[PDB]
Amino acid sequence: IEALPTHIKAQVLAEALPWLKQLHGKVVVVKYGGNAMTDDTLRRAFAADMAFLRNCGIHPVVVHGGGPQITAMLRRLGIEGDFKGGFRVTTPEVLDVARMVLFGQVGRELVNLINAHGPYAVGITGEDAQLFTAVRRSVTVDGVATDIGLVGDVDQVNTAAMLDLVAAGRIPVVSTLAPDADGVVHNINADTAAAAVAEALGAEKLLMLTDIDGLYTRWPDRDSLVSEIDTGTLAQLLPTLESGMVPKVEACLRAVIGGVPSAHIIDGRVTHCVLVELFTDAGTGTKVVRG
Amino acid sequence: IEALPTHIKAQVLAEALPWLKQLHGKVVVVKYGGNAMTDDTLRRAFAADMAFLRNCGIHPVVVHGGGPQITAMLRRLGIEGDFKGGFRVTTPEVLDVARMVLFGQVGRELVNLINAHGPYAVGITGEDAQLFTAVRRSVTVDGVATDIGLVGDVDQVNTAAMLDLVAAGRIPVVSTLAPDADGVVHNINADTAAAAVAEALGAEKLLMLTDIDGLYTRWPDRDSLVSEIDTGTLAQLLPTLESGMVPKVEACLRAVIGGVPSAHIIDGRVTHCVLVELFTDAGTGTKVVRG
Amino acid sequence: IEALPTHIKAQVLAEALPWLKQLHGKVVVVKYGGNAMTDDTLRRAFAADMAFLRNCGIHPVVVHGGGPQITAMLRRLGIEGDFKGGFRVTTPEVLDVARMVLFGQVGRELVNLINAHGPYAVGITGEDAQLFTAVRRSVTVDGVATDIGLVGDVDQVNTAAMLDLVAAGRIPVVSTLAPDADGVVHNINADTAAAAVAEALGAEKLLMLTDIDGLYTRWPDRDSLVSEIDTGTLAQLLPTLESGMVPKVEACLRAVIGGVPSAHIIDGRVTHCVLVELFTDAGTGTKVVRG
Amino acid sequence: IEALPTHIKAQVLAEALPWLKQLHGKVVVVKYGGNAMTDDTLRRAFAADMAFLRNCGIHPVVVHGGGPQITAMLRRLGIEGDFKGGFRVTTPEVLDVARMVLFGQVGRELVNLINAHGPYAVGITGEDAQLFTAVRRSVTVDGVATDIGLVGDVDQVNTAAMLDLVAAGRIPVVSTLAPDADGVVHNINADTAAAAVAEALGAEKLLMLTDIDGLYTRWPDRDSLVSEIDTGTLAQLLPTLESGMVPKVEACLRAVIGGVPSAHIIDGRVTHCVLVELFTDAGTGTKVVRG
Amino acid sequence: IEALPTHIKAQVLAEALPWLKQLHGKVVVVKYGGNAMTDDTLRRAFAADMAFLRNCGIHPVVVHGGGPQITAMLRRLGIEGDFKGGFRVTTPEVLDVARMVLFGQVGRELVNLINAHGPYAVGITGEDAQLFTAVRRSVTVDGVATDIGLVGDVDQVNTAAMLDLVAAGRIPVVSTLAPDADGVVHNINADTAAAAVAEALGAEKLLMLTDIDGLYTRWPDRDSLVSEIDTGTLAQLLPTLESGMVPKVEACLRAVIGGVPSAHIIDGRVTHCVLVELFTDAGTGTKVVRG
Amino acid sequence: IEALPTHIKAQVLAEALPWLKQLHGKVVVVKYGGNAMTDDTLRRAFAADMAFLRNCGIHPVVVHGGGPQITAMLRRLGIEGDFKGGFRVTTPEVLDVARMVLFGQVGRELVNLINAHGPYAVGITGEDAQLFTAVRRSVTVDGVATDIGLVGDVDQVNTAAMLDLVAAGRIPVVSTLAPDADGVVHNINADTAAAAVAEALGAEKLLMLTDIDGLYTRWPDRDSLVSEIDTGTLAQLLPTLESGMVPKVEACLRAVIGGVPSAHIIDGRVTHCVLVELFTDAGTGTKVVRG
Ligand SMILES: CC(=O)c1c[nH]c2ccccc12
Ligand SMILES: CC(=O)c1c[nH]c2ccccc12
Numbered sequence A, B, C, D, E, F: 001i002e003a004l005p006t007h008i009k010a011q012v013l014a015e016a017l018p019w020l021k022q023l024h025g026k027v028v029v030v031k032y033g034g035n036a037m038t039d040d041t042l043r044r045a046f047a048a049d050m051a052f053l054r055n056c057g058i059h060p061v062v063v064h065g066g067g068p069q070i071t072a073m074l075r076r077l078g079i080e081g082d083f084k085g086g087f088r089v090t091t092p093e094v095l096d097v098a099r100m101v102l103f104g105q106v107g108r109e110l111v112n113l114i115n116a117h118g119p120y121a122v123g124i125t126g127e128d129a130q131l132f133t134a135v136r137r138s139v140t141v142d143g144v145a146t147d148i149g150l151v152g153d154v155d156q157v158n159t160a161a162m163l164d165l166v167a168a169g170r171i172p173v174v175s176t177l178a179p180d181a182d183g184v185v186h187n188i189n190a191d192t193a194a195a196a197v198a199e200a201l202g203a204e205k206l207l208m209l210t211d212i213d214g215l216y217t218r219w220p221d222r223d224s225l226v227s228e229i230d231t232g233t234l235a236q237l238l239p240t241l242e243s244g245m246v247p248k249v250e251a252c253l254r255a256v257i258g259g260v261p262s263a264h265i266i267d268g269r270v271t272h273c274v275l276v277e278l279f280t281d282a283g284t285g286t287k288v289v290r291g
């Protein structure tokens, strides 16, 4: 990159300024999962980007998943699962494993990566300081909605305590587990939790790292890839997408409808995808806004 | 307890006042382990006592162990251990399990118990916000000191950030894991970590919950049980005690020598042992002070 | 009290916690008079209880009477009184004596008692920092309302300045004298002033120390003693009580109707009646709530 | 005063500015007694001057006496005094009367006068919030020092709490009574207490209102009246003055030696003597400074 | 002034107190121009008066003109003017000169004068910290409104940032230049700008220094000079006054109608006219209030 | 710049992070003059860079020159100069012109440029709020030191008030004029003033924009251009450089010796030279550090 003329290094940084101004002092919630979480080089770049935002006076809040890691640990423990539809039943035993993997394994890796750049990251679940509660959710299995154990949606968020934590300069690394109104901890889909945290905290942007270039209207058609879309159009479009895109898309709608100015589905396989999406116009993601 | 005359209910509470004054606004560090951690009734009482202190404007900091739980999980995972002397070697794999059990299992139970009384508890390790570092320790096996993996002592403590967390009204629940100066996370003996946190934070008292009535000079002699002792006497006495008492005792010396006004070894099998030790003169523990 | 098993000392303190939580950070106004003011042992216990509340992060505000002491001083001064009905006329001369006895004698004893436990108590009248004003009141003498000099009801309260004084950690000891809108100081019935301070400051509880076990519906019938009653019932009941109970009762109605969650008439002849009423369910008082 | 040309009204106020700057933000302690306390017109002017200072962002602290008023009340109460030398013995009974007269009578008049201009004045004794303690003093009766009861000198001052009270915008009206180290309240000479408060609070000036034009070297010689004098000269001069001037002079030395930049003995029979001494060069007082 | 008896120096200062109370903590905006700006003795007195206000905890904000100085500099620069009606066209070149004279010459003199008394004065234009914007204004030339270049009225004021600057203790010296919504700086009539700043900042008073004794109803009739007048009367009166009085009068109406309690037209040729108008009843100015 | 692959736009921004961390929360003083001040494109880029720093939570302080502009205005005014050596004598008349050009012309352009990005820039001289004083300096003319009027060096800096201004979020644009100890304003060489402000405010870096690539040891030898040098080496080197480099170099020594970690001489003819020097390793400047 040193064969690059210095006058063009200058212009790339200069073109970041319109977005430094837009995001100064603001909350950006990032859903982090996928190849950006499993590959070492993408990992270290993601953590450096959180340090970047932080050293610009931007306020990142990281919400992370970890589905495949939970599965692996359940297999290592010989815990036989029950499956309704394509869904595993979250028994009390499965939750304990989920919680212990999400918070005591996956969240730890990111906290330590980020913290290589300074005392920024702090891990939390909705259990800590009663930061958020959960409400048990049911699922639709081929027509009928059904119960699959201690799985839920974010219920209420302690908006005030969360933003105190962020104003104190900390990067909250969130593992999506929270107690219900009776104190029974549920596991929450990390995508939908990111959308709820973003809306609760008045985030300026929601970033959803995904293992795809962006939203395709008519996948596989390469020409069908869109760069920006409104909630109304995207809602009518949603019952048409690959099984894996539904949660990422539903998050963007819930968030953007809920007042978050924009939600972005960006390519987590691109090194420093966060910096390219936020500080560059050459991003590959797709931006969702209200309409 | 209602057959108890009201005029004596009155006097018991009145006699708590000399200790409410002594402890008002102050930090009390509690090592929590043993039967007080495994039994349901003692569990709920311990958490209620932390809520009590907190609702008196006293500042508890909880440091917890969990040795037997780590062993069990290693056995459930089929992870064969190596043993030098009576010590298990903490490989990278054993640390990941320890960290995931301490922080993602044991600490969670206490956070949720305490938090049944309000938004108080918050879990943390030395990894979060760089709260404390670790230095690799060696051990003495029948004469010679040896290496047993990623096990260490608390190195430095972020005293300022810790007391901000406490002034914000939070009860820090600490899992004893922290990175070394190179970012490699070590597991720390929970007893010695409690002594280091107490001294770093200028605690007024160190409470060490133990499965015994108190320190015996000449165990089994029931008459040999002492109520208070100075560091000088207790140091010359230390090479004489049951294997299990050494860590609890070494903690009290390191702390009290380090300026903590008193450290107490109290009976964790007594319901509300924290309240009896702090707000009553009828305690069963033994108090260590400087001399 | 040492013959009392330690496990029951433990449970008495544990049962205080539901009320420590309820009252944490809150204002409790206490009317203090009667035998609790004249007997040495009750005196010292009352002051220790104010220190207790304070060392729990509860905010006591003490309003005191002193009728019999004013009478005595007037007799020592040879000041002949005029009496309309059963009421002494408060001339300018009688007010000066009242003010000087209430603020310069009675309030001083309590300030010095409380302050034996720390720098808490501070004496004040509505004159200081313009904390509250008075409005001249008339009285009903056998049918007709009449003028009995410079006696009044609390008019307006400097709510903000009062709670600053309390947030600064001080226990306000209030002598019920205040200027009217023209600067002429009036004496205020201490019971009704306690009710006005409690309502103005958003107190959580009003405690009225009285020389009786509690409110009797049909005094002398011992069985007629009630433990809790609503304002509607008690209002229809009020024109039936002993002459001395009317002021204590009228205070509870004015306060509870005014939004104070509960007002209590408690036995001031019981040592530490404040602690038993607030931190115990075995209290002898009667609780008034809205309805 | 309206026959006075407007251009000279202008210049008088303009010439106040060098002293407005000198005193801005600073503490001025005023001993108030004598004819300035007993005459109605001087009274109202003194209180207006305290309001003046306050509305300039200057911080007055008023310390008041009241000897003759105590005597009168003792006579009205038929309390026979004991006299060693020319000194009355302060029995427990005499103290109660002194305290009740100073704090519940004399201090009240000034609080209400000052407070006619706003919520400024607040009465206090060393008893309140433990603001200051007293140490029992003995006296010299024709050669030998002797005990005359509960009379003392200011021992320690809660400098911090006092200046918080002043930074909150309040004019402390101080009655000179305070507890000793055992809680027994003593009465303190108001002149010497003013000197101790001034020095403790880092006052810029000490004003001592007196019923005289100023210090005379060789009273009655009218020419012997001095305008300024150093502590060294005045100390060698002190054993030569009228009985009444000794306390006012000893106060100025203790204060000025103690670091107060200047202490002034000013004519309390001059209306608005405070304003003329502070904001004018035409003052009649005598200024004491270090040397 | 020393031949003046001290008891009358006392009374002049005492009579300032009703206005010290009225103005304590408040904003007073002063338009400064005319002979009070050009004469050395009036200059130094004006600056001392701003220091006076400041050392009373009053908040002056100074808005200054400088028309004749701009003319002179344009003549020294040989810049030929264009005149529509009696108005000079403010070309880009004339603005640069105006800005450079107002801010870099006239404002500097006052900042340095005021600052001889302390670190108070600070110069600013609407350009600094975006304190205020301008909107291009047109003028009426014998019937028709016309364009005379980059001249405008104050558009919006950064009320918050301005009062932060004043709460920090600074005396803002304002040169009336500000950018329009496109960033093009305009020059603003200093009289109308004073009226807009006073209203924006919630000023208690607007002072307009003028080279006249006050408003005359029927100039030259000496008897026609009025001391106070309401906005309704003065508005119907405005189309009758000397050309020079219109701007000063229009300012007072815009301000007083806009909620400023009073605006004063005072004689800037009187030394310390600010002190006589604010702290004396003998002022020569005329007070405008709402009606 | 869009033909540039997105993965290299990503890496350029990522490589800025080590310097974002180094400079976070810190003061950077920039001397601004030369072609970077006169050319429109460099102008707008410099102001955007100050906005950049500011939107990263870095604290720029801009010190500007303007020598050639003063000369031009003196010529436009027909003010004949006196010259001792190669130095113009700064008469009172020349200072007024300098001050009016520096503060009322040159500083205004930069304030308005910067402020196009937000309410950041604020102009000031040492006159405002007494921010800094000047001490008259003499100069060396062919051997002998001589007087050339009201020209000086920065004497003392109000470090506290300056950093309050910066903590409030403002970019101070400094025109180098300040009063001496008698209030007579002097003009200060802008290079030496930048060095004094940087050292006074504890700046992390001093940037000196210059119309050259960097320091040449043996100019014209292109190979003699150095990238970094210590103060000791550079001091022995100083009496060898082109007349124009002496002031820029003397500034770097005074600053770096005074504790500023590094001072940089950077090419002001390079667009966004500030961003390339601070956030890139490809800079053309030369870095001075202590040794
Ligand atoms: C280390 C730290 O500040 C925290 C770690 N977890 C937290 C939860 C709520 C508030 C603060 C924290
Ligand atoms: C010693 C003290 O703080 C006070 C004593 N009396 C007061 C009245 C209002 C506010 C404060 C006080």
Ligand SMILES: CC(=O)c1c[nH]c2ccccc12
Binding pocket: E122, E123, E124, E128, E129, E165, E170, F122, F123, F124, F128, F129, F131, F165, F170
């Ligand atoms: C020296 C100072 O505080 C200021 C000088 N100009 C300013 C403009 C806005 C806020 C502050 C200032």
